Design a protein around this ligand. Structure first.
Ligand SMILES: Nc1nc2c(ncn2[C@@H]2O[C@H](CO)[C@@H](O)[C@H]2O)c(=O)[nH]1
Ligand SMILES: Nc1nc2c(ncn2[C@@H]2O[C@H](CO)[C@@H](O)[C@H]2O)c(=O)[nH]1
Ligand SMILES: Nc1ncnc2c1ncn2[C@@H]1O[C@H](CO)[C@@H](O)[C@H]1O
Ligand SMILES: Nc1ncnc2c1ncn2[C@@H]1O[C@H](CO)[C@@H](O)[C@H]1O
Ligand SMILES: [K+]
Ligand SMILES: [K+]
Lengths: 330, 330
């Protein structure tokens, strides 16, 4: 038996969420639909301009782990919070979902990471992230037994921003592959890809990463192209399996020359897109670690993603396993 | 001119919200639909049993103040938080809505009040409140100039639980009436009324309170009767104006022998009832301080209340002023 289906590793963040008008993003020089890194001064400034908000546990990989647990898989998470109230919220929410979470805070300062997420009328989300205690995630936080006992270890491209997190991930790759497990990553954000393009390609080409998640813009950014067909051909050559999402156009799963196209589900309304890619990964990796076909993995991904975008909060509040049963994906 | 239309005074609380099944309340001996006071140990215990949650600024009077500001009225708030992250959230949210909020934290312990609110499938809400820093609210927190400059000062029956808050309220009553202003209270909760029945009646009969808010169960509790008609007659005899809500059956406003019935909004599906009474008071008091008819104050209350129960979070995230305009209440 394997202790865990999916271990995820990422920046442990609490989301601070508010709806804004289109002009707010322009006035504050916030890049729409992107992850904008901010310092403590800028965090204070933006918060002062933000309307009344709601808080919810976030973090890309955090959300993915939670989604796997929701669907019925066995999940674990590495990510560093502070010993403060926001850290306690994060710890509570992930553990309450039944995700193994044991990363120890190193003190109260720097404080727990937070992201101010501004949701526009079109449902797009623009994130402004102070990493705080995330900068302290390092090799000391790798629970080697957990990596050793997880079918897939999945990590964020976002981890290349803090200083020592990459060293943890290299340790995870070694342990995972020594124990016959698979490694996976998400490209996270097109500007993140702009920052770490060479490093990400090296991860794939050296075989440190076996399965890659991207959206259209991230794939385009990875190869600095406007040609989506080129991006697909190249990503298929650079990694064993690629899952590429295309928003309302669903997704395509690539393996060698194999291509499997999957439709997006029908939705009532795009309330808030926060978590879409994270939950696509949840559904895909749940399917994958249950031995499902790549097409069915895609379908599970699109189902979870479609559900999360119809609510406020990056982690579905409803039962994904029940939704999967109803959709006949079981 | 007057600086403020409505000053509210209450327990400053951050809500921690989760959906639960019916059995959870029974298993945990939580009184359904009520405010259950808890100590620090019980707070830890219930949190350990709670699922993934969302946080949102709460506090009955805090919600009411926010609602008045949302509608376009000029509002202020007294309530005590701690110098901690939850306190910072509370401070941000109320000030961001444009409510005057200047109450200074006294330290980091006790920490900021929180309430674990469990919402059942029927949309009912069952609150479990650790008062924390609320126990420190006292006469030293009365901004005398603010009370002097507010058309109405409104406070929670809930304030009779912490030890010294009542002293602040009596100071408010004196200043308000010395400056020709009006005093208002909500009965808050039927068990709260059970606890402080004699004191509440004394506040009304002595003329310290001019305008009283109750729901059906609170009014019944106040006179320990099963006869709602008796309750209406008696409450009208005990205070100058009474606003009595009847859930789906709308509301009735009483002044001496005058009675004005108002219809509730027909609701598609009740999402979460948290804040219904608070926002009824927002609509009523906004109308009242704009010189509107008692019936129209009722209509405004029912409009705001109907909006808040169709969302997660006790403070409407949409424009109440715009809804009031569409409704011809303006
Ligand atoms: N139906 C629909 N699905 C979306 C939309 N945006 C994102 N998604 C889903 O979320 C995933 C990641 O963006 C996509 O593969 C889709 O499955 C949308 O606008 N409509
Ligand atoms: N339509 C409707 N309104 C409600 C309900 N519960 C509370 N409210 C509104 O909120 C106020 C306080 O409960 C009432 O006067 C109602 O207008 C409900 O179930 N249906
Ligand atoms: N730098 C970051 N690293 C990891 N996750 C992030 C970052 N910024 C925002 N997020 C998370 O992205 C999620 C949506 O994909 C949000 O829940 C938010 O917490
Ligand atoms: N003891 C209390 N005093 C004042 N407000 C409270 C108390 N317990 C819960 N609340 C608030 O009641 C609101 C709903 O009316 C919630 O937002 C919650 O924060
Ligand atoms: K969402
Ligand atoms: K609500």
């Amino acid at each position: 038996m394997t202790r865990f289906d999916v271990l995820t590793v990422g920046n442990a963040i609490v989301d601070i969420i508010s709806r804004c008008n289109d002009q707010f993003l322009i006035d504050n020089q916030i890049t729409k639909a992107a992850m904008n890194l901010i310092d403590a001064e800028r965090a204070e400034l933006l918060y002062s301009r933000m309307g009344p908000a709601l808080e919810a546990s976030g973090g890309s990989a955090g959300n993915t782990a939670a989604g796997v647990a929701n669907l019925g898989g066995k999940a674990a998470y590495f990510g560093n919070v502070a010993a403060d109230q926001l850290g306690d919220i994060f710890t509570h929410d992930i553990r309450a979902q039944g995700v193994h979470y044991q990363t120890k805070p190193k003190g109260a300062f720097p404080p727990t990471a937070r992201s101010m997420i501004f949701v526009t009328e079109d449902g797009e989300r623009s994130m402004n992230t102070y990493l705080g205690a995330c900068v302290e995630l390092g090799p000391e936080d790798v629970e080697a037994d957990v990596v050793a006992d997880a079918k897939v270890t999945y990590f964020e491209g976002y981890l290349w921003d803090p200083p020592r997190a990459k060293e943890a991930i290299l340790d995870c790759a070694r342990i995972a592959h020594q124990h016959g497990r698979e490694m996976s990553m998400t490209l996270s954000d097109s500007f993140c890809v702009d920052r770490y393009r060479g490093e990400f390609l090296d991860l794939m080409r050296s075989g440190k990463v076996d399965i890659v998640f991207a959206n259209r813009q991230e794939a385009l950014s990875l190869y600095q192209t406007d040609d989506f067909e080129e991006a697909l051909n190249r990503i298929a050559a650079d990694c064993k399996i690629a899952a590429v999402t295309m928003s309302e156009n669903g997704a395509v799963i690539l393996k060698g020359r194999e291509r499997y196209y999957v439709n997006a589900i029908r939705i009532r309304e795009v309330v808030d897109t926060t978590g879409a890619g994270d939950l696509f990964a949840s559904g895909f990796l749940y399917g994958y670690t249950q031995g499902r076909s790549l097409e069915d993995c895609g379908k599970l991904g699109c189902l979870a993603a479609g559900i999360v975008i119809q609510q406020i909060g990056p982690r579905p509040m409803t039962s994904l396993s029940e939704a999967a049963k109803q959709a006949g994906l079981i």
